[PDB]
Paper text:
The RC–LH1 supercomplex comprises an RC surrounded by the LH1 ring that is made of multiple αβ-heterodimers. LH1 collects photons directly from sunlight or from the peripheral antenna, light-harvesting complex 2 (LH2), and transfers excitation energy to the RC. In contrast, some Rhodobacter species, such as Rba. sphaeroides, possess dimeric RC–LH1 core structures, representing the largest photosynthetic complex in anoxygenic phototrophs.
Genetic deletion of the pufY gene had no notable effect on the oligomerization states of the RC–LH1 complexes, suggesting that PufY, which is not involved in monomer–monomer interactions, is not essential for dimerization of RC–LH1. The cryo-EM structure of the ΔpufY RC–LH1 monomer (2.86-Å resolution) shows that the RC is encircled by an LH1 ring of 13 subunits, forming an incomplete RC–LH1 complex with an enlarged LH1 opening of 51 Å adjacent to the QB site. Compared to the WT, the ΔpufY strain shows a comparable growth rate but a slightly early onset of the stationary phase under both moderate light (ML, 25 μmol photons s−1 m−2) and low light (LL, 5 μmol photons s−1 m−2).
Author numbering:
A (entry chain I), G (entry chain 9), I (entry chain A), K (entry chain D), L (entry chain F): 1 to 54
B (entry chain L): 1 to 281
C (entry chain M): 2 to 306
D (entry chain H): 1 to 247
E (entry chain X): 16 to 67
F (entry chain 0), N (entry chain 8): 6 to 49
H (entry chain 7): 1 to 46
J (entry chain B): 5 to 49
């Protein structure tokens, strides 16, 4: 549990950091687009309906 | 400007037309007589595409289309706004392609190499001329050629194909498709093999051509070799283009009906034509 | 005048058994016969071939798939050899009817035999992929061939497995026949609007044409510099010679930029894997995301409104 | 998901196409930088580093480990010609040809150029020489073509220049690579197989006139040929196409 | 020099003759295709216009 | 002092003089042509 | 203005003259075709209409 | 036109003459085709 | 701004001159084509309407 | 120091820039006159 | 912020200058095209409406 | 979190800066295009309605 | 970490000239935006 | 003198004289042809 630092002697930090960055960005973009295509969580349209911007 | 080894190769000779005139480089490009011709024809064709876009009323590059003359003009000239711009652009394209091939010939003979590349390019030029010149001339109208638009020439392909039903019942078309698919497969295999020999597992020495031969003999029991694979690549590509040109040249000229109906000569062969079973019986 | 298309003199020597990096030599065969006809164009030697566990698995599964389709064809002919030869190219194993969904309850005649054949094919193709990977590994080479084959497998899996599952029906899959899968291709285009207006379809066609273009260019270049021993590219990578420099300078003086003796093969592998990758994506999007590609093109600035 | 858009007309197909455009730009960048491992940095016509070098930066070095203890190769790396070039500028401005100062075929410039490759023979997977004379090869014989041994050799001036004595064979590929030609003075030269046309009664060399055969570079060992010697021979024979046009 | 006048004329004519030979050869090829299409039954069976 | 083409100062001056003579001749012909077209069919 | 002759210190006249000839011919052909495209300034059709050739 | 003859000290006259012949022939063909396409001036039609 | 001349220490004058000429010509052609696409700035059609030439 | 990648000295760069600016101002003056003529003929604001 | 000059120790000035010029030109062209696509900011059509030119 | 500086002992600052610039520009363009595609938050159309420009 | 061969003084001078150019470009852009906003505001 | 081509001044003058003679002959023939066509069928 406290020996999780041992992972850095098996993976080199460069590849892990690049892979993690790409993964995190793509996951966040996908989640945002999923929320944006759902009418109940499209915050732009919610704001449009709340303030009568139509 | 120059590559580290380029200087010893830039020597005064190998031209077909002209001499020391036009025997120079502009940056990396070599510009002979046919370099001048290619540049003029290409620039004129591109500016004429832009002017056709102006006349058409669209600036979307995916909606720009230059249509050939209508069928009622036959093989004569047409007004610029209606069919003539397409004809001038076709002339410019033919000139640009031929001048490009001849420029490649000049470069080849300046470097002392064989003329395999201009020959291979001439195959593609001939396929283009089959679609745009020979077939329209035999069918008797410029209106059977395709338009110069990113998505409208696909409409030409679809309409021409569906005139004869499902077009991949054309037999020369089947041969051409098989050649294209085999060519893509062979290109993938060849690139992968050379890269796998030059980039082995980490910390290992480069592999030899013996290792490549061994790999393919282990996989499929045969290796064609290096000379063999390059010969095969050239021949597969050229055969694909040749059979595509053939299947289009015979389409509106010798054949006139559904190609699936062409495949019925085999079924109606006398010594099994009436046997009652299967699909066609 | 000699264009180096066909060899003019042919020589033979002792057969080359191959390298022994850590390949299990007990799984290799003997060398086959030399063929003069093949030797006119490439190498004459046939074999040896490596057969291992994955070779056995792939051969058994592929033979069973082939035999299942063949026995179904013989059944459709009424067991008549004349009808079998006449209506070959017209027989077909069809997937289950649309009303069965993804279920495995379809009868043998109405799509169950198609499921059996498909299972055999699945096993054969994946074991062959594993075989390519392991044959590369035994010789100490990189796994580029396995990844290119993985691209091809991606398109094959989308056509036969992944897309039918997302659509919720085995009837979406491709039948096993010569003319029937051509009919399937045409009907797939007709049902989904016009496949010409699928952008990934266009990209796939661009990369297929590009494979033909790049392969013709590269074969012609290597044949043109073969007078300097340019075909021996693995050595031209390690020790650059006049062949590589002349090829690079030809393409630089022609179109303003060139490649190396290794970068050109990088271009080659990517040009082919891209046709198959973009094709797989374009087929996956059809029917699950876009039902009418022409209308999609109208809404995306590709076709006139 | 048919008709589900996050904004505007942007659905999974639009997302896919834009993701592919980004991927394709990145892939093209990678492919060009990988192609930039030979011939760079760009140089001036006087040898100095050019002001301009291009839109793509030079890639990080990678090392090849050559087999049979031949060493390593790190590219990109310092690249030098390591041979004199007998060319003079025809113009002060750049972009014009460089004219040969002496005989271009002897000096090895233009289509007659050669590269300072390693002075060792090419090896096969087992460490033996890749290319051997068919006499020194064990069990090799002509199989199905016209056997060139004993045929006269005719140059581009339609004059006899020698006779074929042996065939040099690529042992792993099992293909003929060179023809060994004995001249009138009892000396032998190597001719690339790709540069000769073997006819019924003769071998015809279109690139090289009969008098120029004596000028072909020789091999210092009768039994093997190195990479450098191969460069010299192939470059000479190919330069004959341009520099032997008269006669 | 009269020889100079004739030499300039000969160079002009060489260029013009090569251009004329190429142009007329293309026209002869077009005529070949036109004739072989005239001998074919295209008139009886005409395709509709592919361009829309 | 700066040199990229091998021309001296006098050579550049003479070449530019002849080039400008040619340019002015071409421009004069073009001006006459435009005057004729504008009289025949003005575009403003 | 008076030092423009130094442009020949930068550019060799041979390549410049080739490029200038190509450019000027291309421009003239462009403008002539542009005029021919329009119903007005198409001098051939103008003459046909003026002399009732039809 | 005082010193236009110096153009011949820039370009080789043989090559220029040949290229000029090619240019003039192609220009004449271009103009003749443009005339032929018009319904009037088609001397072949009349 | 008084030291903008050092760009010629950074950039080679002749490559800049060629690129600048190409850029300027293409920009001018682009603007002229944009104007010719506009019905209210196509000077050829404006003159056709003004002088009643059909 | 010089920092030069192009081989020009300081005086050469100054002279080249002076001539380049003369040409630029001539081009800009012609363009300004053309725009003034067009705006008088047919204003776009 | 007082040490932003060291980016020239990181990046070569001339590659940055070329890339920056291309980027700025393409950005300006993009914005102008976006404005010309909008009916309420197409200044050519605004002037056509204002001066009654059809 | 103080010693985040040691990332530059893992990542070459030249590659990271280029990648970051490309990423930031593409993200900004994407968000602006999202806003333009929304009928509300399209500032051009908002102003056109506000000033009666249609 | 020179990375380009420039010294400290060279980098400072180059950045000074670059910033002069950037501020000139920005001033021109600001004047243009002020003119457009007065002519036709977008807020 | 630049002398990229190896011609002297007198050689260039003589070559240009003959070239101009040929050019004027060609232009005279073209002028007569245009006069004939314009009389037969004017285009203005
Ligand atoms: C999201 C969009 C934007 C994304 C990013 C945008 C940012 C900018 C662009 C960045 C991208 C630049 C790409 C350039 C990379 C250069 C690669 C290279 O050639 O060599 C370098 C490097 C090694 O070079 P080397 O010097 O030759 O090494 C030799 C070694 O010494 C010894 O050899 P080795 O053993 O190490 O193997 C060598 C091989 C090593 O290459 C690999 O390892 C490839 C691994 C397989 C691909 C991963 C997907 C497989 C399916 C998932 C299941 C397994 C995951 C992988 C498992 C990893 C285990 C290691 O390297 C190669 O050269 C291979 C050349 C050809 C590879 C073809 C790959 C075909 C993939 C088939 C896909 C099938 C499913 C697709 C599903 C749909 C996807 C859209 O290889 C790689 O890094 C391969 C890159 C793999 C990319 C996969 C394709 C991605 C498709 C995305 C398309 C865009 C999205 C469109 C739809 C979106 C929908 C929303
Ligand atoms: C009316 C018909 C439709 C149409 C319908 C379709 C459909 C439907 C599809 C294509 C697809 C493709 N089409 Mg389309 N197509 C049309 C018109 C065209 C035109 C043209 C000029 O008009 C062209 C050039 C193309 C070209 C293409 C290709 C780029 C693409 C296939 C890639 C490939 O290699 O697949 C061939 C390769 C494979 C299928 C991979 C196979 C891999 C497996 C692993 C192999 C296993 C072998 C097996 C075990 C057998 C063993 C044999 C023994 C070992 C010997 N089409 C029109 C619009 N086309 C495909 C695509 O990707 O679309 C996006 C597709 O699915
Ligand atoms: C015959 C086998 C394949 C082949 C071979 C081939 N093509 C070649 C070569 C070879 C060996 C070359 O050497 C040559 C080359 O230089 O490649 C880099 C070329 C080439 N193949 C090209 C493209 C190409 N090849 C194609 C096909 C193929 N080329 C075949 C499949 C295709 C398609 C659609 O299948 C395309 C698009 C170019 C990259 C290049 C030729 C470059 C050239 O001609 O340049 C001069 C012309 C221009 C710069 C532009 C002219 C523009 C016109 C005036 C307007 C045209 C409008 C157009 C009609 C609109 C269409 C919509
Ligand atoms: C290799 C290249 C060929 C493959 C093409 C197939 C994929 C392209 C289709 C992409 C698509 O879906 O479009 C909408 C997709 C998604 O649609 P969208 O609605 O989200 O945004 C674009 C919509 N318009 C056009 C209205 C702005 O958008 C894009 O892809 C835009 C990026 C590139 C668009 C392609 C333009 C090509 C032409 C550029 C220059 C050519 C000039 C020559 C023209 C004259 C021809 C004679
Ligand atoms: C995004 C495209 C990237 C643009 C970079 C580029 O094209 O480099 C060109 C090159 C790049 O710089 P370079 O070619 O002088 O070399 C860079 C120096 N090293 C390798 C030491 C880092 O610049 C030019 O070619 C000048 C062309 C004139 C352009 C005039 C202004 C625009
Ligand atoms: C993959 C399928 C699509 C085919 C397009 C890819 C090939 C062209 C882009 C590759 C990049 C080459 C390059 O270095 O610069 C562009 C080169 C320009 O030449 P270049 O001189 O800049 O290339 C060398 C640059 N250095 C020295 C840094 C490596 O491409 C061209 O010559 C013409 C422009 C592209 C053609 C139009 C594409 C369609
Ligand atoms: C848009 C930008 C396009 C980028 C291209 C980069 C151009 C650089 C280049 O080509 O270098 C050539 C070369 C570059 O310079 P260089 O070849 O002398 O060498 C550079 C010096 N070193 C290496 C030391 C840095 O210049 C020439 O070749 C001279 C050719 C004569 C050109 C005459 C002036 C042309 C100006 C424009 C006129 C044409 C306008 C329209 C043309 C046709 C339009 C359709
Ligand atoms: C779509 O947009 C349209 C087409 C409607 C409109 C757009 C228009 C714009 C974009 C067009 C721009 C055009 C350009 C900018 C016009 C420039 C014209 C100038 C550059 C022409 C100059 C010609 C000069 C030539 C004629 C000089 C000729 C000199 C020779 C006759 C003799 C010279 C011989 C000398 C030099 C020899 C010297 C050698 C000795 C040794 C001294
Ligand atoms: C869609 O958007 C639209 C099109 C609507 C609008 C978009 C508009 C924007 C994006 C366009 C932006 C254009 C750019 C910013 C314009 C820049 C123009 C400047 C850069 C042009 C400058 C030209 C300078 C030339 C004319 C100078 C020439 C100098 C003489 C010809 C030669 C001088 C050189 C001397 C001789 C060097 C030799 C001296 C030494 C001592 C030897
Ligand atoms: C869809 O979204 C829309 C388009 C609607 C809106 C999106 C907007 C966003 C995404 C656009 C973002 C744009 C970027 C962030 C704008 C950045 C602009 C800055 C970077 C431009 C700076 C330009 C600086 C130039 C003008 C400087 C020039 C300096 C002189 C020309 C030369 C000075 C160099 C000296 C001479 C170096 C030599 C000195 C040494 C000592 C030799
Ligand atoms: C699309 O736009 C269209 C085609 C409608 C109209 C556009 C036309 C424009 C763009 C084309 C412009 C063409 C101009 C540049 C034509 C230039 C022609 C050249 C200058 C004529 C040169 C003629 C020289 C003659 C051939 C000299 C010959 C020399 C010998 C004959 C020397 C003397 C020897 C004696 C005379 C032998 C006989 C006794
Ligand atoms: Fe290869």
């Amino acid at each position: 549990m406290s020996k999780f630092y041992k992972i850095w002697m098996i993976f080199d930090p460069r590849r892990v950091f690049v892979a993690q960055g790409v993964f995190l960005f793509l996951l966040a973009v996908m989640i945002h687009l999923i929320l944006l295509s759902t009418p109940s969580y499209n915050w732009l349209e919610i704001s449009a309906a709340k303030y009568n911007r139509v | 400007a120059l590559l580290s080894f380029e200087r010893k190769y830039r020597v005064p000779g190998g031209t077909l037309v002209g001499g020391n005139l036009f025997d120079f480089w502009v940056g990396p490009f070599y510009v002979g007589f046919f370099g001048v011709a290619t540049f003029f024809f290409a620039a004129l064709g591109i500016i004429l595409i832009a002017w056709s876009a102006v006349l058409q009323g669209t600036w979307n590059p995916q909606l720009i289309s230059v249509y050939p003359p209508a069928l009622e003009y036959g093989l004569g000239g047409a007004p610029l706004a209606k069919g003539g711009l397409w004809q001038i652009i076709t002339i410019c394209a033919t000139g640009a392609f031929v001048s490009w091939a001849l420029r490649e010939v000049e470069i080849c003979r300046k470097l002392g190499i064989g003329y395999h590349i201009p020959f291979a390019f001439a195959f593609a030029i001939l396929a283009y001329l089959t679609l745009v010149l020979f077939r329209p001339v035999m069918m008797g109208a410029w209106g059977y050629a395709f338009p110069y638009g990113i998505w409208t020439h696909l409409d030409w392909v679809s309409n021409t194909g569906y005139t004869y039903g499902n077009f991949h019942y054309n037999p020369a078309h089947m041969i051409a498709i098989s050649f294209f698919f085999t060519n893509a497969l062979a290109l993938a295999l060849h690139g992968a093999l050379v890269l796998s020999a030059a980039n082995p597992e980490k910390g290992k020495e480069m592999r030899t051509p013996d290792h490549e031969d061994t790999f393919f003999r282990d996989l499929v029991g045969y290796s064609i070799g290096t000379l063999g694979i390059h010969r095969l690549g050239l021949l597969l590509s050229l055969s694909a283009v040749f059979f595509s040109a053939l299947c289009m040249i015979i389409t509106g000229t010798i054949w006139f009906d559904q190609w699936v109906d062409w495949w019925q000569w085999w079924v109606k062969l006398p010594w099994w034509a009436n046997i009652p079973g299967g699909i066609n019986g | 005048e000699y264009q180096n298309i066909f060899s003019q003199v042919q020589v033979r020597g002792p057969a080359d058994l191959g390298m022994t990096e850590d390949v299990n030599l007990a799984n290799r065969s003997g060398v086959g016969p030399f063929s003069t006809l093949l030797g006119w164009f490439g190498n004459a030697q046939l074999g040896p071939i490596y057969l291992g566990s994955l070779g056995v698995l792939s051969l058994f599964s592929g033979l069973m798939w082939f035999f299942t389709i063949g026995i179904w064809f013989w059944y459709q002919a009424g067991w008549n050899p004349a009808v079998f030869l006449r209506d070959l190219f017209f027989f077909s194993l069809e997937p289950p009817a649309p009303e069965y969904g993804l279920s495995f309850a379809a009868p043998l005649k109405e799509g169950g035999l198609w499921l059996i054949a498909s299972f055999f094919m699945f096993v054969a193709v994946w074991s062959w992929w594993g075989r390519t990977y392991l044959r590369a590994q035994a010789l100490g080479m990189g796994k580029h061939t396995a990844w290119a084959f993985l691209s091809a497998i991606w398109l094959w899996m989308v056509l036969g497995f992944i897309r039918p599952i997302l659509m919720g029906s085995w009837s979406e899959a491709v039948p096993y026949g010569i003319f029937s899968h051509l009919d399937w291709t045409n009907n797939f285009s007709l049902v989904h609007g016009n496949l010409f207006y699928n952008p990934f379809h266009g990209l796939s066609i661009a990369f297929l044409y590009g494979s033909a273009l790049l392969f013709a260019m590269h074969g012609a270049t290597i044949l043109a510099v073969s007078r300097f021993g340019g075909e021996r590219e693995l050595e031209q990578i390690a020790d650059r010679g006049t062949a590589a420099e002349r090829a690079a300078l030809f393409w630089r003086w022609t179109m303003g930029f060139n490649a190396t003796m290794e970068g050109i093969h990088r271009w080659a592998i990517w040009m082919a894997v891209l046709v198959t990758l973009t094709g797989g994506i374009g087929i996956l999007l059809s029917g699950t995301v876009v039902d009418n590609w022409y209308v999609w093109g109208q809404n995306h600035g590709m076709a006139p409104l | 998901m048919v008709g589900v858009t996050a904004f505007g007309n942007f659905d999974l197909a639009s997302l896919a196409i834009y993701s592919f455009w980004i991927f394709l730009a990145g892939l093209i960048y990678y492919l060009q930088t990988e192609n930039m491992r030979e011939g760079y940095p760009l140089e001036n016509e006087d040898g100095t580093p050019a002001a301009n070098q291009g839109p793509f930066p030079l890639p990080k070095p990678k090392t090849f480990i050559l087999p049979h203890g031949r060493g390593t190769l790190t590219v990109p790396g310092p690249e030098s010609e390591d041979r004199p070039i007998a060319l003079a500028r025809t113009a002060v401005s750049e972009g014009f040809p460089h004219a040969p100062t002496g005989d271009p075929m002897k000096d090895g410039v233009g289509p007659a150029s050669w590269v300072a490759r390693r002075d060792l023979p090419e090896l096969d997977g087992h460490g033996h020489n890749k290319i051997k004379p068919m006499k020194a090869a064990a069990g090799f014989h002509v199989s199905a073509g016209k056997n060139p041994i004993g045929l006269p050799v005719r140059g581009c001036d339609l004059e006899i220049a020698g006779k074929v004595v042996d065939i040099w064979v690529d042992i792993p590929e099992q293909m003929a690579r060179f023809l060994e030609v004995e001249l009138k003075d009892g000396s032998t030269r190597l001719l690339p197989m790709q540069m000769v046309k073997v006819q019924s009664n003769r071998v015809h060399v279109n690139a090289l006139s009969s008098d120029l055969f004596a000028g072909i570079p020789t091999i210092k060992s009768p039994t093997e040929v190195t990479l450098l010697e191969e460069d010299k021979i192939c470059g000479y024979v190919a330069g004959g196409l341009m520099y032997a046009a008269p006669k | 020099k009269t020889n100079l006048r004739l030499w300039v004329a000969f160079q002009m004519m060489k260029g013009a003759g090569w251009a004329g030979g190429v142009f007329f050869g293309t026209l002869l090829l077009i005529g070949f295709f036109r004739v072989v299409g005239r001998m074919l039954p295209i008139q009886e069976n005409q395709a509709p216009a592919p361009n829309i | 002092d700066l040199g990229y083409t091998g021309l001296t100062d006098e050579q550049a001056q003479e070449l530019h003089s002849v080039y400008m003579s040619g340019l002015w001749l071409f421009s004069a012909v073009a001006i006459v042509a435009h005057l004729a077209v504008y009289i025949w069919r003005p575009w403003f």
